[PDB]
UniProtKB/TrEMBL annotation, chain C:
NCBIfam families linked to this entry: PRK04191.1, uS3_euk_arch
InterPro entries hit by this protein: KH_dom-like_a/b, KH_dom_type_2, KH_sf_prok-type, Ribosomal_S3_C_sf, Ribosomal_uS3, Ribosomal_uS3_C, Ribosomal_uS3_euk/arc
CDD domains reported for this sequence: KH-II_40S_S3 (cd02413)
PANTHER family assigned to the protein according to its UniProt record, in alphabetical order: 30S/40S RIBOSOMAL PROTEIN S3, SMALL RIBOSOMAL SUBUNIT PROTEIN US3
Keyword RNA-binding among record annotations: yes
Record keywords, A-Z: Ribonucleoprotein, Ribosomal protein, RNA-binding
Organism of origin: Plasmodium falciparum (isolate 3D7)
Pfam families: KH_2 (PF07650), Ribosomal_S3_C (PF00189)
Gene3D superfamilies assigned: 3.30.300.20, Ribosomal protein S3, C-terminal domain
Single GO cellular component term: nucleus
Family stated for the protein in its record: Belongs to the universal ribosomal protein uS3 family.
High-level lineage: Eukaryota, Sar, Alveolata, Apicomplexa, Aconoidasida
Example of a GO biological process term: translation
Descriptive protein name: 40S ribosomal protein S3
From TrEMBL, chain E:
One Gene Ontology molecular-function label: RNA binding
Keywords assigned by UniProt, alphabetized: Ribonucleoprotein, Ribosomal protein
Top-rank taxon, per record: Eukaryota
A GO BP annotation: maturation of SSU-rRNA from tricistronic rRNA transcript (SSU-rRNA, 5.8S rRNA, LSU-rRNA)
Lineage of the organism: Eukaryota, Sar, Alveolata, Apicomplexa, Aconoidasida
Protein name: 40S ribosomal protein S16
GO (cellular component) term, any one: cytosolic small ribosomal subunit
Stated family: Belongs to the universal ribosomal protein uS9 family.
Cross-referenced InterPro entries: Ribosomal_Su5_D2-typ_SF (IPR020568), Ribosomal_uS9 (IPR000754), Ribosomal_uS9_CS (IPR020574), Ribsml_uS5_D2-typ_fold_subgr (IPR014721)
UniProtKB/TrEMBL annotation, chain F:
Domain Plectin/eS10 N-terminal: 4-79
UniProt family annotation: Belongs to the eukaryotic ribosomal protein eS10 family.
UniProt keyword Coiled coil present: no
Entry GO terms, CC: cytosolic small ribosomal subunit
One MF annotation (Gene Ontology) recorded for this entry: RNA binding
Positions spanned in the full protein: 11 to 89 of 137
GO biological process terms, semicolon-separated: translation
Protein name as annotated: 40S ribosomal protein S10, putative
Superkingdom per UniProt: Eukaryota
Automatic annotation (TrEMBL), chain G:
Lineage, uppermost ranks: Eukaryota, Sar, Alveolata, Apicomplexa, Aconoidasida
Keyword hit for Cell cycle: no
Xref: NCBIfam families: PRK05766.1 (NF004424)
Signal peptide positions on this chain: none
Any one Gene Ontology molecular-function term assigned to this protein's record: structural constituent of ribosome
Family note: Belongs to the universal ribosomal protein uS14 family.
InterPro entries tied to this protein: Ribosomal_uS14 (IPR001209), Ribosomal_uS14_CS (IPR018271), RIbosomal_uS14_euk_arc (IPR039744), Ribosomal_uS14_sf (IPR043140)
GO cellular component terms given for this protein: cytosolic small ribosomal subunit
Species this protein is from: Plasmodium falciparum (isolate 3D7)
Protein name per the record: 40S ribosomal protein S29, putative
One of the protein's GO biological processes: cytoplasmic translation
Required cofactor names: Zn(2+)
RNA sequence: GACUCAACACGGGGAAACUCACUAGUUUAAGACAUUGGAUGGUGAUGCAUGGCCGUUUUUAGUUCGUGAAUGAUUUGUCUGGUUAAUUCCGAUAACGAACGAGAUCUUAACCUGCUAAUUAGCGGCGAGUACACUGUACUUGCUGCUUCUUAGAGGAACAUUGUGUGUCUAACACAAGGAAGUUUAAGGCAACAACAGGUCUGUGAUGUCCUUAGAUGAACUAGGCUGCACGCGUGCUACACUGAUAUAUAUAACGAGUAAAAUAUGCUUGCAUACUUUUCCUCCGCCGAAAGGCGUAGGUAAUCUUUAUCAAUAUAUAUCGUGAUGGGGAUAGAUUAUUGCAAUUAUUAAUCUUGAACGAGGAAUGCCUAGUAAGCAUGAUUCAUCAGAUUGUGCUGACUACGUCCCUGCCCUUUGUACACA
């Protein structure tokens, strides 16, 4: 079960949900995986006309991705995530056995 | 470095309310200032903490103009 | 099966379409949320796929395209804004202005923070171009939401 | 304009200045006598 | 038993681990003598004479290096081995000698225990140079 | 030439009738429409004519139309 | 016509429909002129 | 001069505990003495790399390179031709254009690899796709490295 | 188009088709609506009709208001003085009190929370060894205590902190110590008020007005043009060598970026139509070719494959040269092999060979700069089918010198004189 988003507070609340749900269901769960942040950037020039001092600005989009693993029913986990999820976050699922 | 009027008047407003718990010690005065104040960021919180310490070190060596 | 970066930019592009769709169609009322009237909207979207500062700016635009005196009614819009509860507001209109000389007047009041990241977060700013017999008029409206609390606000009881 | 030849302290510069020779021929003479830069012997 | 410390000087990064042994100090798969610059061999030798080969005779300190320029990893390994010996003295060998060891280290240089914060700043606008822009002609 | 068969207008009129909202895409060189197995050159020469006849209206955008079907054009377009 | 699947003739800016100053980073496929103002709502937030 | 006082215990259990610089020259001399590989004739009319633009000017460059690739084979046990080309890549002066790094010519490295495979020091396998040394070659190079270590030690 | 800073590697402008706005031309209706009437479209003009955006004043400290006070324009507040990053504060004060601006705010480098944790990362432990030690090591195979190390969520830490001093003993500044941090710790972006008749209607179906539309100023295609040159002006690359030219070898980074088209067969007679996978990115490898380049496959929509227990160079250690326009240096043209692109001729690009200019460090003038910065060295990305000498990031090699001044220059303040106010 991995998540991806653009706003860190969204992933923070989503993660805070899944640890507490896992502790409530008392099932074996891996610890919160804090992946390195991947940042997307582009530089462009202001002044649409060719006159004036050349001025450029850069942008930054760091994308938050974290991993987790659980031994639980694929149906109950997707139901709880859908209950406690927001459209901004995108989540994928993978299960373990031991 | 100098200081700005906003945090200057912030440091003037307190002390007048609970100088009793405020002492000479910079560390405990700083611990007090976040307890008493409502500044939302750490930098100016500890800035005004140092400023109140700076006013205390001139307290009780003559008139202090206020408080 | 596309890369996550391309998925992110694609959804950003789709919401870039969505917000300008909102700007185009949401003219008979303010903003009452977005859907992830309604029948035609959802049909068009699916077929193509497979206090409110923005509303106040639109109201000031509709003002002038009715052909109303600007000076008499901008003050009324200002009263409406401070009755809605803004700390302050600023309306700037640029263009011909009933003459062949380009002018501009700013209507400042209240706090009206103008620079800084806190200004970016708190100030809701909108701009709009309105056609006119001999050109267009640019209207920019900025309104700061009432203050979490601003860093400059210091108070102790 | 070089003029030195090979026909007739061991540091190459000193030997070259002493015998009026180039550095390469000086190094060759140094090898001949003993038997880029390195620590002095 | 086994203690592990870290090293960050300049861009390079290193990992140190001090364990009981017979004086086997290895950098990656090579020896510290095989670095090539004897100038930096002097730098790695600097901490050793400040502590003691006799006291190192029973400790093995493995070292890994991954990244950075030559000066960067020599300084990184210097400070990493300083931290490793300090921690392993604090833990295993003895504490009475540790205070004198750290006193000698600081009275010789503060760069051994902790490195510098200097690093390359983001290249600015204007021109090729970071703190300079292009030549202009009137 | 570019003569447009009558069956083409018949099918496109029936399609827009049964749909009610048509996105026809400003591009004209694209061979086909995702939901129309028809060349896309004719659906413009018909749609601009119909709009100029003041029966359907287009809000317009960049490279997109979003033509809407009005209430009064249904009777005329039926036959 | 003589269309080609390469070069500036293959694709153009989506909003301004011009053949000049079109970026291909991350398949944005848009012109910088309008990208400057659409950047914020797209998500391209400037930090430096 | 080339020997220095070492204040820590060495291992000398393989090639990784000996210096490369003398290892390459010593094993090139051993290769010349043993005539393990050919020169070969064909390679001595071409520059080592495009950026070099000049002859190696040593006449033993093939054997000097063979032992270096052996060293690299042991240093990490997965060798291809791209890694060798990148390692032996050199700067190239493009005339009036700025200097730019370019790779060396890969045919000489391919020939060296084929000759080493013929000698059996290296083997190819699907798993661990890069070139790696056989156990026989590994122990032989271990004993050879220890011999060199003792020769330069005492 | 743009003409001092504030034009001239700028219009993201590295132009074989278009791009293309021009030329020699050729076509088209792609003229909706009610033969005919009749518009849309337009890189046609107008930035001196405009909107928005931007570049300048301008990275500086300045701007404004309420009330009060002093025929009027106006003045004060907004200041003699001290300090500074700054109308930043202290202070005197017909002003008192406010608002914007500055500040402040937020990422990176940077330490800690033995926090919070582990995929694709690491620390280990042992399951079997490859050779040596001896009473583990370099390299291989598999699983599992744990997260300082690889990384990142939150929080803390720095506030002139504490002492020795200067200072109206006030605002501040100085030295020493701890500390990763004592110039806000350094770099960033937001940039007030007002203005330029600054640039842009060639970026837009943003845009009025004037103009064109069948022989189009719409679109498409054919050959060209910005790549041509007595010359001048910049921006840049290469050198003028011995701290260097040539040859090998070892120790090396970070930001990066990466998946409506091929081929096969059938029919007709290589081409057209038809169905099947994906060929349509980086690529590792094994081979053919010095190379350029080519064939077939591992991997990856990506901390997993390029590649990252490591992709460049400055070095580095040793050889030749030993300062002689020399072998330096590569302007110059000739011969070719290959790819890119339907098309490279105005030989794109390119491996190889031959060819062999200036250059002995540069007048008057002129530009840039105070610590990971100068400079050198490279290298990622941009447009890119192919082409960086251009632009914008990243890293390595870490310097000489102040730690101030107003002499020039450019601004700012006060006073002053004006017959100037398009100043």
């Amino acid at each position: 079960i991995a998540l991806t988003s653009k706003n860190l507070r969204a992933i923070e609340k989503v993660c805070s949900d899944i640890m507490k749900g896992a502790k409530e269901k008392n099932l074996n769960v891996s610890g919160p995986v804090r992946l390195p942040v991947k940042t997307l950037r582009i530089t462009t020039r202001k002044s649409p006309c060719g006159e004036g001092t050349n001025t450029w600005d850069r942008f930054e989009l760091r994308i938050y991705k974290r991993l987790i693993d659980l031994y639980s029913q694929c149906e109950v986990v997707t139901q709880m995530t859908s209950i406690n999820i927001d459209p901004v976050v995108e989540v994928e699922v993978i299960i373990t056995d031991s | 470095r100098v200081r700005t009027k906003t945090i200057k008047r912030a440091a003037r407003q307190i002390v007048e309310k609970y100088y009793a718990k405020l002492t000479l010690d910079f560390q405990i005065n700083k611990k007090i200032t976040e307890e008493v104040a409502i500044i939302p960021s750490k930098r100016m919180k500890n800035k005004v903490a140092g400023f109140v310490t700076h006013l205390m070190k001139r307290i009780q060596k003559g008139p202090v103009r206020g408080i | 099966p596309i890369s996550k970066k391309r998925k992110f930019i694609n959804d950003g592009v789709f919401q870039a379409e969505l917000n300008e769709f909102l700007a185009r169609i949401l003219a008979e009322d303010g903003y009452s949320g977005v859907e992830v009237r309604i029948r035609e909207l959802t049909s068009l979207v699916q077929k193509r796929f497979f206090l409110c500062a923005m509303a106040q700016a639109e109201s000031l635009r509709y003002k002038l395209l009715k052909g109303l005196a600007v000076r008499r009614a901008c003050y009324g819009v200002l009263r409406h804004i401070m009755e809605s509860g803004a700390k302050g507001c600023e309306v700037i209109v640029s263009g011909k202005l009933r003459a062949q000389r380009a002018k501009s007047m700013k209507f400042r009041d209240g706090y009206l923070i103008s620079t800084g990241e806190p200004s970016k977060r708190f100030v809701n700013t909108a701009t709009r171009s309105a056609q006119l017999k001999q050109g267009v008029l640019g209207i920019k409206v900025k309104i700061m939401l009432p203050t979490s609390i601003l860093p400059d606000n210091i108070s102790v009881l | 304009k070089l003029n030195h030849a090979v026909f007739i302290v061991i540091t190459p510069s000193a030997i070259a200045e002493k015998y009026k020779v180039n550095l390469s021929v000086a190094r060759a003479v140094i090898n001949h006598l003993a038997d880029s830069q390195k620590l002095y012997t | 038993k086994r203690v592990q410390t870290f090293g960050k000087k300049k861009t390079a990064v290193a990992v140190a681990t001090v364990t009981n042994g017979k004086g086997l100090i290895k950098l990656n798969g090579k020896n510290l003598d095989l670095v090539e610059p004897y100038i930096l061999k002097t730098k790695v030798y600097e901490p050793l004479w400040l502590i003691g080969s006799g006291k190192l005779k029973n400790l093995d300190i493995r070292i890994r290096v991954k990244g950075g320029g030559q000066t960067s990893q020599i300084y990184a390994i210097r400070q990493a081995i300083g931290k490793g010996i300090i921690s392993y003295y604090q833990k295993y060998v003895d504490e009475s000698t540790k205070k004198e060891l750290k006193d000698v280290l600081l009275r010789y240089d503060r760069s051994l225990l902790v490195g510098d914060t200097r690093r390359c700043e983001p290249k600015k606008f204007g021109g090729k140079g970071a703190r300079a822009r292009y030549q202009k002609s009137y | 030439y570019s003569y447009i068969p009558k069956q083409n207008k018949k099918l496109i009129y029936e399609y827009l009738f049964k749909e009610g909202v048509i996105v026809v895409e400003k591009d004209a060189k694209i061979p086909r429409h995702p939901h129309l197995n028809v060349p896309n050159l004719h659906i413009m020469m018909t749609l601009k004519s119909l709009k100029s006849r003041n029966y359907v209206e287009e809000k317009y955008n960049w490279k997109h139309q979003y033509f809407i079907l009005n209430n009064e054009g249904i009777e005329y377009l039926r036959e | 016509v003589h269309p080609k699947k390469y070069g500036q003739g293959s694709r153009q800016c989506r909003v301004c429909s011009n053949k000049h100053a079109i970026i291909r980073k991350y398949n944005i496929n848009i012109c910088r002129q309008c990208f400057r103002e659409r950047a914020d709502i797209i998500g391209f937030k400037k930090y430096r | 001069r080339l020997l220095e006082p070492v204040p820590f215990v060495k291992t000398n259990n393989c090639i990784k505990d000996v210096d490369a610089d003398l290892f390459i020259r010593s094993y090139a001399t051993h290769l010349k003495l043993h005539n393990k590989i050919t020169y070969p004739k064909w390679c001595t009319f071409v520059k080592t790399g495009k950026g070099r633009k000049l002859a190696p000017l040593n006449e033993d460059w093939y054997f000097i390179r063979a032992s270096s690739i052996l060293r690299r084979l042991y240093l990490h046990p997965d060798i291809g031709v791209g890694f060798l080309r990148r390692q032996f890549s050199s700067k190239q002066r493009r005339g009036v254009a700025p200097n730019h790094t370019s790779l060396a010519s890969g045919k000489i490295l391919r020939s060296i690899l084929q000759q080493l495979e013929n000698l059996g020091y290296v083997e190819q396998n699907p798993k661990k796709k890069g070139r790696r040394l056989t156990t026989k070659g590994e122990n032989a190079i271990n004993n050879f490295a220890r011999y060199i270590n003792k020769k330069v030690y005492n």
